[PDB]
């Protein structure tokens, strides 16, 4: 039980992430409302076996968000500043618009590209070997939405849900090459992910509490599924099961579509502290880690729901075909 | 300076009861103990057993050195960090 | 010829299993192998 309260008693967890280079390493970001404390902005690092408090941190009075790590291995750290700028730090070392999203594009030959979606929608991208990083390199793409999801197999293509109620798609060759919109349910979508399995399946979730299986091969979505709290964070589970999860108000609603229908498979309120914030599952153990709106951290383990091990694994492509069948049924 | 930083962080580490920083000799530079003679018998004879321990860990073969000697008992916790000039021992609660 | 000797030997099984578990838990110490990343 590692319930971290380093300072963050008056902070609010904005993001939680894990490290592939160190599978036992996790980095969290929070935003503070009380300035009468240690410092401003947040990036905290710690391992699973290390002391509850964050082992390593970065100290400054700079509010920092849009955090991501070097793609090959944890050697460089990138952050998208609140004023549209971008900063990069050597890990092996001691604008009228904010940036919304950030991503590394791994080019193994050299440094790895940087893409930042701003709060207006427009996308920027660049990379430079000198990391003291100079934003002089830059490219701009005419982008309308805020959270841009990229195509796992073909990283140049991307999509987004816009406030106008559509879901735009395009790619890196031209920002205007392919400017149609996904219209599965045609709602103001603010979240997108991709099924981390065989297909080119992605998901997009709207302000109207609607979740949408964008199969890249289709213009009409597969399973127009539907549930309160779909504005907020969604995720594909790091299991063979295509498990879905939404989480607000110290409450998580969980879907295991691999064993049951689109009704919620589990739901859990948490009394540790109110208003759960960002979460993290690791593939290794079901020690699920979560933050709270009070800035604290916690974790629990429910191993019986780990895996079903027969239907999730090779029947999952059949399950996606079955979802397309459910579309033919909708028709 | 790093000896200062590490002594400081050990002091910050709650559940510690009696700190014990010695040199390679039996000299307790600083100790959070109620009585010093107790720490004397230890900070003297434990280096003897540490010489025995380095003796046997090399008796295997000169492949590794005694990096730590951290023992946990029912009542407390005797952390021992063998150091080039020093040795960083602390009596903690075995939490 | 003493079989009760072998029974007393088997009696060590509880402590030995607990110690096997303790050894599995304390298998590997923390590794912080030296590495240098572009050192610029």
């Amino acid at each position: 039980y590692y319930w971290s309260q380093g300072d963050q008693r008056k902070k609010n967890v904005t993001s939680i992430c894990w490290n592939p280079l160190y599978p036992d390493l996790f980095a969290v970001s929070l935003g503070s409302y009380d300035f009468t404390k240690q410092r401003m902005g947040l990036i905290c690092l710690y391992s699973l076996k290390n002391t509850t408090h964050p082992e390593y941190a970065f100290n400054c009075e700079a509010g920092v968000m849009c955090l991501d790590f070097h793609p090959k291995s944890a050697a460089l750290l990138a952050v998208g500043l609140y004023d549209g700028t971008v900063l990069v730090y050597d890990i092996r070392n001691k604008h009228t618009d904010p940036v919304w999203q950030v991503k590394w594009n791994p080019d193994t030959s050299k440094n790895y590209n940087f893409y930042s979606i701003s709060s207006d929608g427009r996308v920027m991208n660049w990379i430079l070997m000198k990391n003291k990083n100079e934003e002089e390199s830059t490219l701009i793409g005419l982008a309308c939405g805020l959270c841009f999801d990229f195509n796992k197999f073909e990283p140049h293509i991307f999509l987004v849900g816009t406030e106008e109620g559509k879901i735009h798609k395009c790619s890196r060759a031209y920002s205007g090459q392919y400017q149609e919109t996904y219209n599965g349910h045609l709602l103001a979508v603010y979240k997108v992910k991709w099924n981390n399995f065989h297909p080119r399946t992605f998901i997009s979730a709207s302000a109207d509490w609607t979740v949408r299986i964008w199969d890249s091969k289709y213009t009409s979505q597969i399973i127009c599924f539907d549930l309160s709290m779909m504005v907020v964070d969604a995720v594909w589970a790091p299991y063979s099961s295509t498990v879905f999860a939404c989480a607000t108000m110290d409450k998580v609603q969980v879907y295991d579509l691999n064993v049951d229908k689109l009704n919620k498979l589990a739901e859990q309120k948490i009394v540790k502290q109110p208003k759960l914030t960002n979460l993290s599952f690791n593939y290794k153990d079901p020690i699920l880690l979560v933050g709270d709106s009070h800035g604290g951290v916690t974790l629990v383990k429910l191993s019986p729901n780990l895996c079903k091990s027969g239907p999730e694994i090779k029947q999952t492509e059949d399950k996606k075909a079955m979802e397309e069948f459910k579309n033919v049924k909708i028709e | 300076s790093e000896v200062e930083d590490t002594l400081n962080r050990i002091k910050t580490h709650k559940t510690v009861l009696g700190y014990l920083i010695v040199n390679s000799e039996g000299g307790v530079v600083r100790g959070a103990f109620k009585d010093e003679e107790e720490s004397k018998n230890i900070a003297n004879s434990i280096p003897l057993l540490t010489k025995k321990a380095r003796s046997v860990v090399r008796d295997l073969d000169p492949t590794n050195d005694l990096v730590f000697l951290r023992i946990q008992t029912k009542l407390n916790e005797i952390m021992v960090a063998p150091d080039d000039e020093f040795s960083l021992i602390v009596i903690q609660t075995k939490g | 010829f003493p079989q009760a000797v072998k029974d007393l030997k088997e009696g060590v099984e509880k402590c030995i299993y607990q110690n096997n578990q303790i050894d599995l838990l304390e298998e590997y110490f923390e590794g912080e192998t030296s590495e240098h990343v572009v050192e610029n």
């Binding site: 076996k49 290390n50 002391t51 | 300076s1 790093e2 000896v3 590490t6 962080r9 050990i10 580490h13 990096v67 730590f68 951290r70 946990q72 916790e77 952390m79 960090a81 063998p82 150091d83 080039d84 000039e85 020093f86 960083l88 602390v90 075995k94 939490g95 | 303790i22 838990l25 304390e26 110490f29 923390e30 912080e32």
Partner: peptide, 23 residues
């Protein structure tokens, strides 16, 4: 040099001098 080498030793010393037995 001796202070710095003792420091390098004491670094990992503290590192796995915090990690104790847990459930």
């Amino acid at each position: 040099s001796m202070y710095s080498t003792s420091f390098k030793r004491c670094c990992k010393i503290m590192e796995r001098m915090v990690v104790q037995n847990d459930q």
